Amino acid sequence: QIILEQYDVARKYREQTLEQDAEEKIARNSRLQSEIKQKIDLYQTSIVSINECLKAMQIFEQLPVITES
Amino acid sequence: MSKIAPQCQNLREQVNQLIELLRQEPTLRSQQDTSIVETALGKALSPRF
Amino acid sequence: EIVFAGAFSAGKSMLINALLERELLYSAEGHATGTECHIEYANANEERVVLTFLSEAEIRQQALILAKYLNVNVGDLNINQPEAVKVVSQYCQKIIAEEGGENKSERAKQANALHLLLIGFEQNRERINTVQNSTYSMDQLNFSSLAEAAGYARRGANSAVLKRLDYFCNHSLLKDGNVLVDLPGIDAPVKEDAERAYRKIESPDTSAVICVLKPAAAGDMSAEETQLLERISKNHGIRDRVFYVFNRIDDTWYNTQLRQRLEGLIQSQFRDNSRVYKTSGLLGFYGSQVKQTNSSTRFGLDSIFATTIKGFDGEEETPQFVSEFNNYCANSGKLLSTAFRVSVNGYETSNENYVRILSEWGIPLVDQLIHDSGIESFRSGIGLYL
Amino acid sequence: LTLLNQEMQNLGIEFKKYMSAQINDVVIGNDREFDQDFTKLKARMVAR
Amino acid sequence: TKALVNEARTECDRYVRESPRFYDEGTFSIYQFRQTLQQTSQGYDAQAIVEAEPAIKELLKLDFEPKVFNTVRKNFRQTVNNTLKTHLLPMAEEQA
Amino acid sequence: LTLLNQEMQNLGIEFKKYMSAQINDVVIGNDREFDQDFTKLKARMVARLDELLKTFSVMNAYKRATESHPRNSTAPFIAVLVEALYYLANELEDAFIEAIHELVKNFFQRLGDRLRKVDCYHQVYRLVGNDGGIEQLLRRAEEDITKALVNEARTECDRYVRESPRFYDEGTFSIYQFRQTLQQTSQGYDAQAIVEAEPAIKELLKLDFEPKVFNTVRKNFRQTVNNTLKTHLLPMAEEQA
Amino acid sequence: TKALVNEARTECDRYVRESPRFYDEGTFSIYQFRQTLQQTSQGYDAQA
Amino acid sequence: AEEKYPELFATLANDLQPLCIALRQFYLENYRQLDSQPREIAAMKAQE
């Protein structure tokens, strides 16, 4: 009962680094998102070129990517 | 060849990029089946009957 | 501590040589019985190796076991007795001749193992202590280079009597402090060797484990491999620090059935695959070595594969690597999505076909071949993990 | 502030106790309405 | 609700299985069709089969009544109690 | 345009037919992988029962009894049997749940792998720039079926605690054997004396439990799994169509 | 007060121990459950 | 010249699509999972 009594003290003690931790986490998430975004654009260019190749002579459509949101 | 076309000059490299992306992703190597596509590509380029 | 474990002849030593781009260890079938290997970092001026020989007691033990299996009627003092050593050596030679070759039969392999054990004990008797294990360096053994010591240990008898080998060389992979420990094949004839390897992998000091798996060439999993996998999964300390490598993947590039078998097996068993890898240690290592050659040496045939290219009747035997390179260009099709337009001629020899292909294309084809081997991916993954 | 925290913990304990008491009252059969509903269930099934 | 409906559907499908009480010869034999077939049922109309309705009704009574009685009197109470006590308690803990 | 509409209708019909064929192949037993998984399930269950029972210890049951009653340092000798029953049932239920999870996930992964090859599902992406809702519905049904099966297993396993008459066979082990220990033989409150009776109670638990587990595993679980699959997937396939 | 409450708690916990007077067969045998179990208790309810 | 030669490209594409499907699904799942998290520090601190 007592240990959980003093949660305020622990938060007061961790406020000195909470901000930095949050900023670092946000940066990490944005970095990974942009990385997989770049990979997606490369894949999209490849599939676009492939589909344009086979369109000239045959009817087929490999899966593209758009509005991933 | 009657139907020889210019568009698919670089189809080679597009397929290469797809296999490279598949290899790069570790978890997706469980589904790795690149070489059926490779054999189909081989019979696509310089076709033999 | 990175420990490589798996079935005998699974390519652990060859895979290690591929990681190091160096022919340090010996990929001898039927000869690596209980020889544990350790690789450590060392300055370019501090390249050195330390060799620990099997004690006379260990030699007598394995000789007794081999004689018991081979049903040769002799005493227990044979190794010390010169005439008894000669008798057992001739008996093993007769067994090998009857079987038609050392590698032809299990009994032939064990007879040759005993034969080379006794020959090495006689040759290295001065370097073998009665009970304790004798340790020596190059300066003690008058070795002028790491290559010379590797050749000395490559000999069947020396490997038969050598217990532990600790090489030291300059490599960026070892710079961080990584120690590469190659263990005897789990399915090795010696139960003591298998137990030693199992204890080493189970040892807490083992930081990482690399399991080399045969199914890439076998089409299925051996009983010993299944037992090792079960023991690994049961061991909590190391089950979270284990990486799997499928060597000899080149066999499945042209054989579709074995390939589908491998893919189904991997999907069925290993749910997680961030720690699994597929590689061809032979092709990667040999391509790395060939990258250092030029036309004056026929791209390594006169320098790298001179030993393996000299036939008995004067005909140039095709190196296994040349044969597999021609097969890679012809049927594997991993070249089939690149700018190269390799063409294999059936009216030419394998070695000459190789010469022509690399003369026309050069080192870029070798780089593509190495990328197909995929040693770099496994190396980078393990390095990033560490 | 600490008295507020104490009160929240006591509230949680009390809610857990009440839910356990209700469920066990149903289990034992002390919930008369549930018994009525269940006997209606059985009678309807047999009649159907 | 989903768990209980799945329980009920899974338990009820076993009734279709032919229990030996469905095979009691003395009450109703299945061969009684042949008498209708042998020139008594002059056509493809199933009107003749209507004569056997009471016997098959009694046979279905014998086969089914024990199944329903056993299931309702044995399992459903325990199933409901178990589902409630195993679902609500963790939810109460998470709420706390 | 009308040909496109025709094609969509035919696609829906084909998907329904394929799903029905797969489920009925599983039901009949023609799915060899599913048979392998189910026989592994049964063998694991029997092995777990045998191993757990042959390794049972009275002291563990007494420790469980002491845990169950914090406000007393001593537990009556009878509490050993009760805690033994409850421990057996609980561990068996946990094994059931984990194995059910394994089986369901493996089956669904196999179905997904083999479903992404046929032209019926392949043709969806050609005329539509997405997959529709196949993956979402498949995952939803996965979760629902797993919940239903774990509820089935938990409900069926709790009946084992009930004392069957095979637990009361006098000739094997009488419950009154405690009195001989009590009458000055157990000079203290320590349950060390009770350890002597462990083999007889082990055999009694064998007799009581083996028929229950054998009957349940060999009779109900196969039918329960088949019924859950055939009654959950078909409506989902209709909604997908 | 603390000493006396400890005394009382320590002395009272011995009552749970089964004395032989709890095992007298002539008054009540523990096997009387089996008659209820053998088809007399048609259910899992402890009403019997 | 006319019937068979186009067929090779058709079977090539048919065999190619599955891995592209897997790549697209995996990348989209990762993107949507990453976008699920909050972006503002004020709301982020509450999670910690």
Residue numbers in the entry:
A (entry chain A): 725 to 793
B (entry chain A): 1 to 49
C (entry chain H): 50 to 435
D (entry chain D): 484 to 531
E (entry chain D): 629 to 724
F (entry chain E): 484 to 724
G (entry chain F): 629 to 676
H (entry chain A): 436 to 483
What does the paper say about this structure?
Unlike small (Ras-like) GTPases, DLPs are large mechanochemical GTPases with a molecular mass >60 kDa that use the energy gained via GTP hydrolysis for membrane binding and/or remodeling. While DLP family members are typically not highly conserved on the sequence level, with the exception of the GTPase domain (GD), the resolved structures reveal a conserved modular arrangement of all DLPs: The globular GD at the protein’s N-terminus is typically followed by an α-helical bundle signaling element (BSE) or neck domain that connects the GD to an α-helical stalk or trunk domain. Recently, a BDLP has also been identified in the genome of the cyanobacterium Synechocystis sp. PCC 6803 (SynDLP). Taken together, the recently predicted cyanobacterial DLP of Synechocystis sp. PCC 6803 (SynDLP) is a bona fide member of the dynamin superfamily as classified by activity and structure.
Yet, in contrast to other BDLPs, SynDLP forms high-molecular mass oligomers already in complete absence of an externally added membrane template and/or nucleotides. Using a segmented single-particle analysis workflow, we determined the structure of SynDLP oligomers at an overall resolution of 3.7 Å. Based on the determined cryo-EM map, we built a model of 8 SynDLP monomers, which represents a smaller part of the segmented SynDLP oligomer structure. The last 19 residues at the C-terminus could not be resolved in the cryo-EM density, and thus, the final refined atomic model includes amino acids (aa) 1-793 of SynDLP. The monomer model revealed a globular GD, linked via a flexible hinge region (hinge 2) to the mainly α-helical BSE domain, which is connected to an α-helical stalk via hinge 1. The oligomer structure showed a stalk backbone connected via a complex interaction network from which the BSE domains and the GDs protrude laterally outwards. The structure of SynDLP oligomers resembles the assembly of eukaryotic fission DLPs via a complex network of interactions in the stalk domain, mainly mediated by three distinct interfaces. The SynDLP structure indicated the formation of an intramolecular disulfide bridge between C8 and C777 that covalently connects the BSE1 and BSE3 domains. The structure of the SynDLP oligomers revealed only a small interface between adjacent GDs, whereas a large area of the GD of monomer 1 contacts the BSE1 domain of monomer 2. Yet, the determined cryo-EM structure of SynDLP did not indicate transverse contacts between GDs of adjacent monomers.
